[PDB]
Amino acid sequence: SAALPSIQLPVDYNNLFNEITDFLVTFKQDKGPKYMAMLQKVANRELNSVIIDLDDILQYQNEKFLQGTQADDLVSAIQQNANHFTELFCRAIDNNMPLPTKEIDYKDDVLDVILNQRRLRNERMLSDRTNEIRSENLMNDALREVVEDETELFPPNLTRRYFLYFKPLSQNCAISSKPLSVRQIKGDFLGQLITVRGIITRVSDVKPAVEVIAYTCDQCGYEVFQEVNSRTFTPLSECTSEECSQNQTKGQLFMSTRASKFSAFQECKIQELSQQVPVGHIPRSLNIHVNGTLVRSLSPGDIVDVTGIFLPAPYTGFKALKAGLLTETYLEAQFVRQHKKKFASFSLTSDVEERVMELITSGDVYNRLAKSIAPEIYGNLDVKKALLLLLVGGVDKRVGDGMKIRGDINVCLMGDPGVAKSQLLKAICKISPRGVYTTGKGSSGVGLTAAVMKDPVTDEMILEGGALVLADNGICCIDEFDKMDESDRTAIHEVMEQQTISISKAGINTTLNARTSILAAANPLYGRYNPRLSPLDNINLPAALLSRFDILFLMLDIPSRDDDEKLAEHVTYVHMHNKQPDLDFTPVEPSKMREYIAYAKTKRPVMSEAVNDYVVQAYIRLRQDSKREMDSKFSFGQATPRTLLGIIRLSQALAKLRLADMVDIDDVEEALRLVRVSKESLY
Amino acid sequence: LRIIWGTNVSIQECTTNFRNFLMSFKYKFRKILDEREEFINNTTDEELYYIKQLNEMRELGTSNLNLDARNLLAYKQTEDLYHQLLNYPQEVISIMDQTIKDCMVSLIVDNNLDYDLDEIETKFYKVRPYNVGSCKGMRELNPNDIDKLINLKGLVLRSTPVIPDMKVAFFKCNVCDHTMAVEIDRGVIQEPARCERIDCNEPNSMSLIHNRCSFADKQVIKLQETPDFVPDGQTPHSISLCVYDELVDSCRAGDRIEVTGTFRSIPIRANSRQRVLKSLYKTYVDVVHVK
């Protein structure tokens, strides 16, 4: 006892086990107990993950203390040492697991049938041993004790299907409440339950990580299990079965992958937000380990607050650098809170329903959502409407022949320097759930990237692309578009007109998927617009590329005695009070706007016969007008069928904005108005 | 009675159901499941599909039968056999092979055909299922789907040369020339510790003869998937098919194929220290049928 001394610590695991059991059984705040009902759902093979809400534990403690009964601080103990309480909760759950009310019906997962077989087999062994010892005729409690001591059951670790996760305390109700940057995650925090706020960089693909490898000895008819808790393990070759061990007869084992226990595995490598990096430093990353049903919850370019256990791992670096018991760390993920909700995860529940009703019932949804984009920017209403339509996006058609239409808008913001073009791109980046802000020539020098590197966790080569693939189902806000080299322009040709990227470089013969809406902002030729030169020369965009952009605003800068003084008043007020000046409307915060945009994206409106006739006539007239002024001073380019498609797309987006399944004639009129006034500032 | 351990399969019941499906399958059932009853033919639908197929199998002499799993879904009596086939590839496939041999020999016997049964009982018949459900891609296959039938479609990028795979070792006793042949079981070969003869016992008399072992074909095919659905920002993924026996050298580079097979996982050895395996398993697909 001298070699391994002892320390008394304030924690008593038995009292905390009793508290855990009582909390699980008797928590009703969220008819029946919440966790008992969850366990019942798990037993019926519905839920595979048990989420232990720490706020529930805190409320349980508050109830117990308020009535006067003494209850130990379970929440603090969980936060201080999270790893052990995982197993404590797991065993408490395994004790209180109810029995299924819906049996196997030939459609159940193979894991479930294997677990049921193991459970029935060990119960049969226990009962058989009880019967034998009772028949020997040498209280049933002693009999139970002796039979459970004398039998080799399948351990409870191999008869549980659910996964256990902890949800950190909400900050408003209340350490886990305060998210921390990667820099602040010091060595003092190991073993705790912390929340790391950052941006996910590189998520590997799901691969099976073995937890308990299972063997079979054909000679002795046993199944031997070898627990694995290391990145690397040593396989077994000689039988470990007790009876087969005493017997001197040779035994050989074989792996049984179907019998072994696996956990879905993923590594994420979150970085720091730009705001968290101190002055002069660069952001640094932190590994994240994802196990169980949390896989596929984290994607590259996600702003998240991952909550997990900050466990260490044995060092795998150079022995020269290792001076002591050096350890490399990671964060075993437990809860993932996306900072910006994805559009594909929208669900029309009452929570979003009430706020959507609040928006629509007040009316003026189009103007409110247009003005709410960058309220600090003044007077640029039409471009804000165009950006809103960009966010909503049109409807993409898929004819049975295989023909596909984009259903996405592309906006180009041409204009004189200093008209707040680049500000709107950043506002869109802050509104859109996914997006990339490429800029310039040197930065994002390859928007298309034919990068095929090696995955550190899995040796199989993964394909990596530029911002375009990261901007899948998003907006690729491109800045300084004109200064971009010709190679990226040629790639963006295909990216705008189709939704794919075709690569045939050395090592890669593939076709990436990038259904990305391109938003660009570039200055005209020779810096400012030169009214001497033709508009098609100031823009300097070839007709093939220019046709792709649905709307190309000109946003020229022209001095005025009234407009400029209004703009100066606006900007000076913004600098004085960090708020939008006017009190006529309260702006919609990006969360509410994003929710409404997702709801609108759910709808898929359709055109109308009279609407189709109006659009056809408008397209014919536009084509005639383009033919007439094919060489005038205002030749903004010959009209193309892409102009008709853009009219359709804008009309569908406007219909989506009103939450309608039927395209309206006034929507087409407004789309025509926007397309026409995109060049109105030219005069 | 007598379900196998770790499975929901009973040999007798599954063989009974498969024989029932073979005897009484008509393509009109698939038409009904396809909701294409307006296209029902009087000729082809009336005729018994698999019985006829087994006939031309007998005259032609082939040894492989291609089964459409949706036909199994069409037959009410074998709806459960469909799920049993998805969840338990190897067992159910072996059951099907034995049933095919049984049905062949029974059909010869019942009609008292002049064709001899010498070849039939000596031959080995194989069942190759296909059209087994949807694709689901590879990003969506969780580790619980190990050893299940999956359907994959994509482009064949690269095809490795033929790799011999040992089937029977040929250890030779140096002393008394006790040449025992050891078949491989579950990818394991067990060396005789000493000479298996009782009169002669010399552990060092064993020296494996590489050249006189009997091998089997194995070809690894690199398939880049083109799934019907792609998640946001997912670059194309490459998976490694592993064909065997007759399917070797069948799929050429640039072929756009749809492949069904068993989704497997195998430990990969960390070659830093020998006989030490990484805890992350490499995933590959055994191939049963190529369309």
Binding site: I104, V113, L120 | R2, I3, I4, N8, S10, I11
Partner: peptide, 10 residues
């Protein structure tokens, strides 16, 4: 060889 009783489940 792997045969066991059918009362395990259905």
């Amino acid at each position: 060889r792997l045969m066991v009783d059918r009362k395990l489940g259905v």
